[PDB]
Design a protein around this ligand. Structure first.
Ligand SMILES: COc1c(C)c2c(c(O)c1C/C=C(\C)CCC(=O)O)C(=O)OC2
Ligand SMILES: COc1c(C)c2c(c(O)c1C/C=C(\C)CCC(=O)O)C(=O)OC2
Ligand SMILES: COc1c(C)c2c(c(O)c1C/C=C(\C)CCC(=O)O)C(=O)OC2
Ligand SMILES: O=c1[nH]cnc2c1ncn2[C@@H]1O[C@H](COP(=O)(O)O)[C@@H](O)[C@H]1O
Ligand SMILES: O=c1[nH]cnc2c1ncn2[C@@H]1O[C@H](COP(=O)(O)O)[C@@H](O)[C@H]1O
Ligand SMILES: O=c1[nH]cnc2c1ncn2[C@@H]1O[C@H](COP(=O)(O)O)[C@@H](O)[C@H]1O
Ligand SMILES: O=c1[nH]cnc2c1ncn2[C@@H]1O[C@H](COP(=O)(O)O)[C@@H](O)[C@H]1O
Ligand SMILES: [K+]
Ligand SMILES: [K+]
Ligand SMILES: [K+]
Ligand SMILES: [K+]
Lengths: 467, 467, 467, 467
């Protein structure tokens, strides 16, 4: 009579089972797939939220092996600039410089009559027209001569266009130019981040979100043109025709573009996304820390069941599932993977790190940052308006606005969390992320089983970095 | 051995499943049925409680698309007057006026020798006997003449009886009279509330409760005579013979009267109510916020199972179910509908609004209103007594007395709550209330699933209007 | 592999189902059986605990329709005296009196020369030897005569032996004597408590506990000789051979004595008690408010399942079940009955009433009384010792010592609680306790169902007498 | 689809069932097996943790009938010295003594011219070369003679080598020597601890842990050479090949050594340990009070199911199971045994006793001791380092550091806890630990059943010693 499918389960209803293992935590292999064609070094992506991911965090995350997704709550050029920033990220030097009109006396004023390498010569703005060296000047007496009658001319310089160049240097100092022969710096013949997630040309990978409303074409175009590695079409309802249509159109317009579509929480929803053309299915309706959808609307599916149901279909097409929302501890990452996901998307876990947007706030002598639902009033009010234009029709939010404890640097957080994954892989005898994802077993536990799992019956005196 | 049917479920044991959808929240259709013949524009009715619904709230609710139920804790004429108030609600002007005995000097005292429209002329009390205009007087010198020798006489006036009249005006100012030609105002040729729930003649709908005890005939009669749209026979035990008898008698006496009977919590109970003649089955034994029945008596049925069981029968006769009690958030409304209800009856959700009875109370520098069970001592003590008459026989209450946070205006609350319904209809791909009610699917969740549903693991900094 | 029977259930896991009803709460019939041959007017007995039941409460409870069980933590004669007190409870007057040696002047000193009824004449100690009346003296001048030469002699008095006598009075004042013709008072030709639980001779019923250890014979004998109506052999383990043996012996020694045996929590245990000869099976291992057995020992059975299992057997022999422990609200009484019990035994519910032993304690400006497990250290330390005698062998308690809020008078508590029963009987359409016990149905509910049952989502401003 | 075995259960999900019993708590038999060949007098062992077990507690526990396991967070010789200490524990006297060079005047200086037993004579360091008695001196005048010309020579002494000797005394005072004839004390012809757990030669039993990393051979060798009764190879992952290999090697090197291996939480894991050669299977992955494994890694198995699954296999080979972690109250011990374990290993239950390592700490005017996971940062930092050597590679802890309330003496704790076991054995009619372990039955209970089990609805005024 009551129309009810079986009991759906979330992270706290299950525990993974230990198994025979020849795997040590530090030998565990963390590599996995974000989409059919994009590899991750760690099974983490960052949420596309104005309180989690801008260029700063996207770069830091990619350096550690994951991919950040730039949020859409900014203008097109703003978003494209963010992507571009990530794509060109290098860490070049930017030397002291003179004019073709400046005199030798000007130069001697700078050098202080003791030897020097040289000064790149630049025009009114900002053309590079030569160089003057400690050997061009050592024996020039006439302090009145302009730098241009004694400089090494344009053609004797060794240069590169911005964007490894270390190949062309095989000469040991090279001047970076652009398309109008305009100086941008210098690089002088000299791996900090071996787990970096990078594209075929050794650039850091980045993603960016656009959402499903009509009229996104201009935004998509600019993001692809800025070299985005993966496009996320993010919606609170991936099973909506609107979303499927938007995915179809984007697939048809960029047949090689890796696209993530979601969110869904069912087999059917994962099926309709795959049919629309996604390269990856993003799963989660309502499990997010800052989410009130389940309460406001009554709709949702516990996240371990949502994952397994979406993966049941997505596996049949070779399509990876992304588990998005509700990850609170590193043991949830293990569980989301064993349920069928190839990686997890996280907000709160990364929010409040140094790298996330926003400044630190003090509240009762303790450190926090802003963290808010993308569907909260504040996140939505940066709507398209200016409130000058906007106003019986008030928005009904499905997210809250809050504060989250300051976490410090992203790198240490990732290391803490992946530690716990590695240890689970040793416990479950999973060599690779695939083995955890396809072979690990669960048991179902009661509320009393979950209390035994936590710390219990002792006073914690010190905070542990993973708990 | 132990006599036990299956596990019964309440709101927090279930979540609705998202589905393929061509529905947008703002295109969702909220219309539904209160009874076999009365349509609602929104699936909400207000509880019949002395701390929720009197004329004030009944009018405000009907203007928004629902129906209020006037409570019975007042005299017959009091209750009939409340219904009448709702039925005649308009928002007429009520102009300045003179006597047939008053002189022209009296008039000139009022006008101040500059032009005027006119003054309706009235008797000792309160008959209308004519009009005197700025053109009746402009050239009357004799300030001593009585208004009656120069007034426009009774028959040259254009008038209407109280109770659209805008048809007869096709003349642009019309004088409202009653049956003794007595003046009541004026209306001068001039839609704020398009979702208003209205009867075939464009009057706001209203309901009123009587309860099941013998001797209600006089009360019913007066309520029907006051134009009540729907009679509620409300009881803590709708499956009691007393209640069924009372419903039978009322059906026989008013074969066209829409009658709501309840409350029940079973198939059988819904069946016996339908057999007795109800136009709608009201469901809920014990789920109310202020209810202690379950604890005091040990009896009750979790409300999602109570709804589905009652709807299983009521569907077979085309009879709508009203889900009454236990609605706390807008997601519960979605759930109660998907379980089989056509609308929800709410107390606490509306209590504490400006429109509900009682004044605002301050308690520790914060705003509240009184909200009490109709079976609490205070609600019951307004019994029939005066305590002068009343007293080893003390009442045993099944409701408590309390306070509820001030909510502000009803209109904003309704908009907040229906927002969440609309969003669920988009999530579940339900175009109409019927589709949610008959096609949406649930999953069953654990206590851990319900914690994931809420906000979790972040500090809320601002209160969201729906949470 | 793990040796586990099905899920056992307690009060909060179930709710009763409303049903068709021709029963009104105030017409509900509360009468039930304590044992095969002893009727109760209300389905309550009081626990045999030194903080719940001594004569005071036993009398008050019997007057309301139940039976109190005097505890065993006192000497034999102490316990027999308590029983006796209950058995003889009447509410006699006790007039002013003179000596056969006292003079007329002594009498006139007392009367003050205005008329008087008379003075019963008594010996050195305390024999009754006659009467002197206002008419024996009115005309006796000689103030020196001793009362004995003018008294109405022994044989003209109308008298009764202690222990209705109102039959012999058919004469209107009668002098109460004992076996040595010794005066005890007077009763002068004059129903407050119609629900009183009484024996065939109109005396209040009382029970008394002895426990199962060897050597109880003397105690049993004295209790039977004091007119105890029902003997309780109370143990934390009724399925222990020791207990069954003790029951066997007592049955053989008093074939007509109603005996309660327990506690058990299984079919088997109820069977072995019946076989041993009990007139009633008492059920409950670990559910008591002050009990720590379940935690200390790991043993126990949730009380609704314990009841139904014990009743499954006990029903086949016509033997009533007593549900003992874990009753917190009046809805638990309804549930315990529907699970199969004929009445409930309560401790905390009665503890802290005026009538229970101990004085009121103030603790932070609020009223309490002592309430302790009979297996707590304090209850057990009144062992048999004096601590002078007693002491690597310390007792290991299965009960705690605590305080319970002052409740006031027992009568009001009973009325509050039976109110809730009556209302459940109306809700479930149970005319008699038997119908609730054998025909009412349960549903099983989740933790979320139990939260809906309570008060929720409102601030209680006043305490309700049943909640 | 989701890969899930049945619901696993922990202590609070179950209760034992009372049964027919001829067993009294004080007649219950507590003896059980630690391994195939080592008997315990009580079914308790202490955890191998630097905050629970060093020699002090190992000795106290063995005296009460259990076995302590010395932890490995110390050097080899340190650990061997601890074992040795336990093995030689006696409670000898150590008399006053003189030199062969000291004069009679020196002696008379000590005696004070009144009679004396005698003085054992010792060399430079520390050889025993004779004795001088109150009868050797009574008649020696020459105060200048050296003790050696008047002493009773080496050969007239009655002596024993360190390590019952009371047999050789059959002479009543005997001088304890070593292998270089060096004096160690004296024992003079004189059962406090009858439940002592002892080896075939009447020495207290002790265990010691080594862990599974390569290179443990030297440590094992020294522990065996120090007379360890049982070797524990303890790991957070007993199903890891590394652990199984280490067990294999140790079995092959010491075919008669009793070895405990673990921890596992499955049938398979218990099977692989038995195959590797263990004499006992230790069970528990994640249930420990101070454990965060379940949360950090997501892996674990509720402990009652982990026990029964491991015992299902281990029973088929006659191999005992040790239930390790998550024991909080004495009722958990009963449950762990009935689930299949032969004894329990405890940390927090013993931590904070006088005997456990560490000093008492005051924190807000109350007594505590340190208790920490062996996998917490602090426990692990005593790594092998000195931090001078050690440092993007920080450890990821699976244990926390905390404080636990001071418990007093271990003996009283054990007596409290075994009290509760004994009482359960009476309740379940289990004469021996074997009967509880193989015949007792469980019921499964809800969260509401567990609340009824606890104290509820009363204010505890005094702390009970077992709760
Ligand atoms: C896009 O971000 C999300 C996602 C991924 C999810 C939910 C959600 O509320 C939002 C924010 C809601 C927004 C931005 C409103 C616009 C819309 O999407 O129509 C959710 O409940 O599951 C998944
Ligand atoms: C007799 O009172 C009880 C009863 C009825 C129960 C329990 C209990 O602990 C005591 C007190 C325990 C005592 C007096 C110790 C003596 C003994 O009985 O051996 C329980 O857990 O279920 C039922
Ligand atoms: C050995 O002590 C344990 C045991 C028995 C268990 C766990 C645990 O974390 C530790 C401490 C973890 C350590 C010492 C890290 C070294 C390692 O073992 O690799 C657990 O979760 O179940 C059982
Ligand atoms: O306002 C919101 N309402 C509901 N879900 C949101 C909202 N904003 C973001 N989300 C989702 O919640 C996820 C983050 O969940 P978290 O890691 O548990 O903080 C995001 O990746 C989006 O899926
Ligand atoms: O005193 C009472 N006891 C139990 N139920 C009540 C009482 N008064 C009103 N009710 C019911 O509780 C409902 C309101 O529930 P609420 O919306 O959860 O506050 C009413 O519509 C009646 O069904
Ligand atoms: O010390 C004790 N330990 C366990 N049970 C007890 C103890 N003392 C009394 N009882 C039982 O607990 C019952 C009272 O339970 P209550 O009504 O829930 O307070 C008594 O009737 C006895 O069955
Ligand atoms: O740091 C740790 N993490 C997890 N388990 C631990 C750790 N240290 C000890 N243990 C285990 O926890 C047990 C003690 O559990 P307790 O009795 O519940 O305090 C030990 O016997 C080990 O099995
Ligand atoms: K949420
Ligand atoms: K309620
Ligand atoms: K209890
Ligand atoms: K734990």
């Amino acid at each position: 009579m009551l129309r009810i499918a079986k009991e759906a389960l979330t992270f706290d209803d299950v525990l993974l089972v230990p198994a025979h293992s020849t795997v040590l935590p530090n030998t565990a292999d963390l590599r996995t797939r974000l989409t059919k064609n994009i590899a991750l070094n760690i099974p983490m992506v960052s949420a596309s939220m104005d309180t989690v991911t801008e260029a700063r965090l996207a770069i830091a995350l990619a350096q550690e092996g994951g991919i950040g997704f730039i949020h859409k709550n900014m203008s097109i050029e703003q978003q494209a600039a963010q992507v571009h920033q990530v794509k060109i990220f290098e860490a070049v030097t930017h030397p002291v410089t003179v004019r073709p009109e400046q005199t030798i006396a000007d130069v001697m004023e700078l050098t202080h009559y003791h030897g020097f390498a040289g000064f790149p010569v630049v025009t009114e703005n900002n053309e590079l027209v030569g160089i003057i060296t400690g050997r061009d000047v050592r024996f020039v007496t006439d302090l009145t001569k302009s730098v241009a009658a004694v400089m090494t001319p344009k053609e004797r310089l060794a240069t590169v266009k911005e964007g490894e160049v270390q190949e062309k240097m095989h000469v040991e100092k090279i001047l970076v130019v652009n398309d109008e022969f305009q100086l941008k710096g210098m690089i002088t013949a000299k791996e900090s981040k071996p787990n970096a997630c990078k594209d075929e040309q050794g650039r850091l990978r980045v993603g960016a979100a656009v959402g499903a409303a009509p009229g996104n074409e201009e935004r998509v175009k600019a993001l692809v043109e800025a070299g985005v590695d993966v496009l996320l079409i993010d919606s609170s309802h991936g099973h909506s025709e609107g979303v499927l249509q938007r995915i179809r159109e984007t697939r048809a317009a960029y047949p090689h573009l890796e696209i993530i579509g979601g969110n869904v929480a069912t087999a059917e929803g994962a099926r309709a996304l795959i049919e629309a053309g996604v390269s990856a299915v993003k799963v989660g309706i309502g499990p997010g820390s800052i989410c009130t959808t389940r309460i406001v609307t009554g709709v949702g599916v516990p996240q371990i069941t949502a994952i397994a149901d979406a993966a049941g279909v997505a596996n049949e097409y070779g399509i990876p599932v992304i588990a998005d929302g509700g990850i609170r501890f590193s043991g949830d990452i293990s569980k989301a993977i064993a349920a069928g996901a190839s990686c997890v998307m996280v907000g709160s876990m990364f929010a409040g790190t140094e790298e996330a947007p926003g400044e630190v706030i003090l509240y009762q002598g303790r450190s926090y940052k802003a963290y808010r639902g993308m569907g909260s009033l504040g996140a939505m009010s940066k709507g398209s308006s200016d409130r000058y234009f906007q106003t019986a029709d008030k928005l009904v939010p499905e997210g809250i606005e809050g504060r989250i404890a300051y976490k410090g640097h992203l790198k240490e957080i990732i290391h803490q969390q992946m530690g716990g994954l590695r240890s689970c892989m040793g416990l479950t005898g999973s060599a690779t992320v695939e083995d955890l994802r396809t072979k690990a077993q669960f048991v179902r536990i009661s509320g009393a089983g979950m209390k035994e799992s936590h710390v219990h019956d002792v006073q914690i005196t010190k905070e542990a970095p993973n708990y």
